[PDB]
Subunit: 470 residues, 3 copies
């Protein structure tokens, strides 16, 4: 590929994304699936609402296609529902918008698919078996062939990760709200995934934002006098985008409930210790992140620190919770063992009214409670394995060096390394909470955001306008 | 709490028990559960015996409350059963005796709940997150405030554990029987949990025992001439308590069978490798115990030595047992795989007569046999990982230093680290065996018990009459 | 046992086999089982074909013995099937041949059962708890008692393993074919278990082979002139044995399909991650084998190298396979979670037509796909844990010292450490492929086989004719 390309940020970000998606054809059949996964969840849940007759399926030998309605009625009953057509049109417009954007990506990743072949000499077979240090070093020393002088291996880092080094400095300085006292829990920590998307939509995307192009910001934000007129323009902007989150609040809420039922409700019956496992929260991914550190380099420490940190949390379980788990598993296991031994004896105490759903619900009640009960012979693991976690993730809040066994070291660590089911809970609440905390919580901090981009923005001569901390 | 308390043994034992039950309100809602767990097992098994009509439940659409009898017949059919009323009265008298004793404990632990707050400055929130070295050091250096001179940190150990340092010396000297040749197994080792309770009821509880109070013993047992008249008083005493175990034998036997069915019979269907796991036996807990070593300090080595010792036993499995397990799992898995593939084909070979209980019983037959089969790729673990177990539990019988692979190192170690299902078996046999071995086996050793408390009882000036070995 | 035995190879091979089968009575009840396991698979699958009436079992309250036919019809319908009688006679002749050979082994292992008792002083109780270094040293220093002069501890190794040191040198020199390009996979590696049996039937068993007795070979194969007349005798011999594999091809094919259904088809429903586990292939067992190294000494490194090598293969999983596994588990788990939550709601959407087999087949579809999905938090294990595997298994093909992350280090290692399900696949194909590659692939290599036994056969004065490499 060719002489003096127009955008060295969107180019290098797609060179990196092609390597991490393990090739062109793997990313292509990958991103087909999420367009099909959106289309499956919307079309199958619309068929369940309108076109399955449950009176035949519940009460009234019957076959499984006897419940289903014919296609001349399947397409008819769906249309005298003005709410559901309004759901299907706005879902349909968003989907064809996501279909146009995908065809635009195939034309653009094919030009970088040919960058590996014809300029870096790396096939799509050898590409999942290269590291990034392979792919990066091909770009650096072949710059005599393609212009695209002696940049650095560092100046490719500032271009792939320019707008990620701002979210590191906005979280470490608490210029984004991220934490709220509510009565009942204490100090809760927000910053879910749909909230981080808005923070760059306030700050980095569009003509009316900062950053007129993707590599330099406005000249407005470097002049002084503290410019409350310039800080006011950001202040009403969070309104018009925050009102947009409030009007689109009911339709993102429908999507998060549908997606959680289709991807977690069967895992509840089999293995509810899966949802009792923990995962590094998005607040923790922005707290343990370094400056100019790629997305696969963050994960290489967050997989190595997963194994100690998941057993650090297991040796702090609540005495009141374990005690309710052991005696709740006794009372449910005792009526199971009566019903289990009564089914083995005669096998006709099944098909009496509620017995088969009672074994199903008591069997998952016992399965939940066995997850809450820790290991009986759990080595209580002298609680400076926190110096093993500090070797992998490199930031501890400094109160934790000798106080590793308290509750001001256990409750602050669960803000970084939350449950899986709390992560499920914060994604369903996310359409509700996000327009409230942009309007009421982010707008008072607008004068410190505008002053942040004045004082900490350093222009480096090759890359452009970077964060000062990075 | 106040000046010169009357009983420094029962006080310090409850200071320790309040810390290990993780607080007042955790122990309170804890001990409510065992009063409810006794009341659940007795009332639910009485309802199953007398008030469920199984002819409607087995043979004669039916609902699950159609089997149950109405309350005017539920309370009527229970009374023309003179055995069951006799069961319910003696269970009822024992339960209200256990209810009076619990209300007496709330009044006494509340006085020690206020000892943490108003004398040690430790709340109930900070208490599960303290160690005993926290709680002990609060008691030691605040003795200028409360009298309760410069005792030691050692003299609190002799008071919490006075009657546990005797059971260490009575087991290590074999003054308690604990081992019996029966034809068929070899030398079996008893000492279950209801037997250890009686040994302190012969020796430490009551006015007619030794130890007139809880901290000093009689003057009778220090005089000499070997006192067969004094050894006779113990000899008929084991009769009157051993006859009491024989008369109360049928009602403790009913309780152990009921409790094992309500807490282990559903674990058989799911996971019978749970009952093939091993646990440190009560003979092992008194054999590996040190002198003046608290109950949580014994468990801290018995959890660290659990992980090597459970895989030391897995690399000694019987060749005759593995061979019957592999070929028994073939013959049962082959008729499963016919019946599994015959259910997938048509799904109406269910609801023909015994097929669904056959899949249930062959499925647990295969599940039992897969537990008996060891790992195919089991590293045969060079059998001096016995020097890893010796690091955690500190006593080996000295034959085992180089002979770690024989059967006189495997069968003596399973006396310390028995199966779980053998522990189940020794609790059901425990009402049967215990009155027999007090009358016939303990009474011949009464002259050596009386001479033991003459020769090994040292009076220390702060604590009182302690064991000489401790 | 007595003076100057006639065959020191078959004696020492049975002294070793008695130790590895853990005794006389363990081997006796062991080898009864495989005669019963052959008889179970043949008789139970014959009853399923001819004597179960499925029209009563599928469509037409019924009992499970109502499907079965009476014995006067059970023995009648089996006889108007000229294919099945031909199957049962040839299975019956092979079984009574395997029954005569077993009674001949009881008479011969009893003479070596008395060799442990009356000449080595080792009972059958102490025998599973001895090592081979116990059993070998008993034979070596008691040679003053039994003649059976100062042989070596090495000269017992050449006698137990004489015909196994040839198969090491025939595989390392590629005088046996073992590898074939087919379009679609690349270079595949054969050498299944029924193929290795034939290679010693061409070379070591019979009067018409090499090795006139079990300890010395013919004088024919040491003379020179390259002897194409002598290489022709081997060339037509592989025909007459290869035609025998082709005529007996349909009846060994029936046995491998029957045995795989009776021992793996129920493991598919429970745990299909079992068949996704890997096992050291038979090509790998002959590639990592040393010279004069016993069968239990090979396994002691292949169990220690099992644990790193099974996680070396898990960190090379295909990006296209993981991506189809995650999105296939979404689409199947979403229709499960609808059907699971629809059964909990009413419990009468069971017994509508195909729902219960749909939960069964989608439940195993999700279970298969969760096996293909790797660990999310898998430490990517810096790929020179290949220096941990090289410590246990002692041969690496030398391209792998620094190239541990490519596909020419992953695909050559799966030839040594193949899947379990590929091992299942190569045993069902084994009756088909084996007569083809003896006739068409082994006969062109006959002149290099005849020249191999001329140049590499060294006569040692105690043992006889051994391989030169060993
Ligand atoms: C001015 C107006 C403001 C506009 C409002 C903004 C509110 C955003 C809502 C859009 C929304 C719901 C759409 C529902 C459609 C409703 C239509 C009707 C439906 C029928 C009634 C899209 O849809 C999401 O649905 C999720 C499933 O529900 C998917 O799963 C997810 O993955 C699973 C596997 O790991 C997990 O389980 C789990 O992680 C998820 O579940 C997501 O992949 C998918 O993007 C949620 O937005 C999401 O978009 C993505 C970008 O692709 C954003 O990621 C960004 O990526 C980088 C980018 O720079 C940056 O690094 C960073 O910025 C950010 O990480 C997210 O931040 C998030 O915001
Ligand atoms: C009644 C009120 C009217 C409200 C107006 C509608 C608002 C829609 C605006 C369209 C909107 C998508 C919003 C998705 C949420 C839809 C909610 C679902 C319901 C269906 C309606 C397009 O925004 C896109 O613009 C790109 C900006 O270039 C972004 O960055 C690109 O990717 C990043 C990768 O890392 C890069 O960082 C970045 O460099 C890239 O450039 C994209 O990620 C982003 O998706 C937000 O603006
Ligand atoms: C002169 C006359 C002699 C009197 C006879 C003495 C015979 C003793 C029998 C009383 C009995 C059966 C009562 C049945 C009631 C029948 C009424 C009718 C019922 C309806 C027909 C009580 O009941 C027990 O029932 C058990 C369940 O069945 C409970 O589970 C248990 O925990 C589970 C969780 O780990 C486990 O699974 C498993 O470990 C158990 O299962 C026990 O907690 C409970 O105490 C068994 O006695 C038991 O009492 C306890 C003390 O509380 C004793 O512990 C002591 O504690 C310290 C104390 O100093 C000392 O350290 C030490 O001494 C000792 O450790 C035991 O030794 C034992 O003896
Ligand atoms: C027809 C023949 C008549 C038989 C007479 C009846 C015998 C009942 C005697 C009452 C009996 C309970 C026996 C429970 C078994 C009941 C069997 C169940 C069936 C229901 C009948 C009370 O015994 C209590 O007395 C206390 C002595 O102070 C014990 O020690 C206290 O706790 C320890 C903690 O560690 C301390 O170590 C210790 O310092 C404490 O002080 C208590 O543990 C003990 O439970 C035994 O005496
Ligand atoms: C001139 C003419 C040539 C003759 C043709 C030769 C073709 C050989 C076919 C005979 C055959 C099928 C017989 C079916 C009977 C059909 C009758 C009608 C049936 C009704 C229609 C026997 O039957 C086998 O059936 C298998 C199950 O199907 C068994 O399971 C196995 O174990 C399971 C547990 O680990 C596993 O899961 C799995 O490993 C198997 O599955 C075997 O144990 C059993 O031997 C397959 O042969 C086998 O025999 C054995 C020797 O005993 C051979 O082992 C040898 O041992 C040493 C010896 O020196 C040497 O070290 C070496 O040489 C070799 O290792 C094998 O090499 C193999 O060849
Ligand atoms: C229409 C064409 C006619 C075809 C003729 C029929 C061929 C049958 C020949 C009989 C045949 C069994 C073949 C089994 C496969 C049967 C197929 C199943 C279908 C039923 C028909 C006997 O072969 C046996 O002879 C012994 C030689 O001594 C072998 O070695 C012995 O054990 C080894 C241990 O390690 C030792 O290494 C070795 O030292 C031992 O000595 C035995 O392993 C072998 O089983 C092959 O010859």
């Amino acid at each position: 590929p060719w002489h003096h390309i127009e955008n060295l940020d969107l180019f290098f970000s797609r060179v990196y994304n092609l390597h991490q998606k393990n090739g062109f054809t793997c990313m292509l059949i990958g991103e087909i699936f999420e367009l099909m996964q959106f289309l499956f969840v919307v079309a199958f849940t619309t068929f369940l609402v309108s076109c399955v007759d449950y009176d035949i399926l519940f009460a009234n030998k019957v076959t499984l296609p006897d419940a289903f309605l014919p296609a001349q009625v399947c397409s008819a009953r769906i249309q005298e529902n003005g709410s559901l057509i309004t759901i299907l049109v706005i879902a349909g417009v968003f989907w064809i918008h996501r279909l146009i954007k995908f065809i635009y990506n195939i034309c653009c990743y094919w030009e970088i698919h040919s960058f590996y072949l014809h300029a870096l000499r790396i096939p799509m077979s050898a590409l999942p078996y290269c590291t990034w240090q392979e792919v990066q070093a091909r770009i650096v020393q072949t710059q005599k062939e393609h212009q695209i002088r002696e940049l650095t291996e560092l100046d490719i880092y500032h271009r792939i990760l320019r707008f990620q080094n701002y979210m590191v400095a906005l979280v470490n300085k608490s210029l984004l709200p991220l934490r709220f006292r509510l009565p009942g829990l204490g100090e809760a920590v927000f910053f879910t995934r749909g909230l981080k998307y808005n923070f760059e939509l306030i700050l980095f995307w569009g003509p009316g934002s900062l950053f007129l192009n993707e590599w330099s910001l406005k000249a407005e934000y470097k002049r002084g006098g503290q410019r409350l007129e310039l800080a006011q323009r950001l202040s009403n902007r969070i309104l018009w985008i925050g009102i947009a989150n409030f009007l689109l609040c009911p339709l993102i809420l429908i999507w998060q409930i549908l997606y959680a039922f289709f991807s977690y409700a069967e895992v509840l019956k089999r293995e509810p210790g899966a949802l009792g496992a923990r995962c590094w929260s998005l607040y923790g991914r922005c707290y343990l992140r370094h400056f100019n550190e790629l997305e696969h380099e963050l994960q290489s420490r967050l997989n190595r620190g997963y194994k100690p940190a998941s057993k650090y949390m297991n040796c702090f379980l609540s005495p009141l919770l374990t005690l309710l788990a052991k005696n709740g598993a006794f009372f449910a296991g005792s009526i199971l063992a009566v019903l289990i031994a009564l089914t083995i004896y005669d096998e006709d105490v099944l098909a009496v009214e509620h017995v088969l759903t009672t074994v199903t619900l008591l069997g998952v009640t016992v399965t939940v409670c066995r997850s809450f009960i820790p290991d009986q012979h759990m080595v209580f693991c002298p609680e400076q394995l926190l110096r093993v976690i500090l070797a992998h993730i490199h930031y501890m809040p400094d109160h934790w060096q000798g106080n590793a066994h308290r509750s001001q070291t256990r409750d602050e660590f669960a803000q970084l390394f939350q449950y899986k089911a709390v992560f499920i809970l914060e994604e369903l609440l996310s359409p509700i909470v996000t327009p409230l905390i942009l309007i009421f919580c982010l707008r008072p901090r607008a004068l410190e955001i505008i002053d942040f981009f004045r004082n900490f923005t350093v222009e480096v001569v090759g890359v452009g306008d970077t964060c000062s901390f990075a």
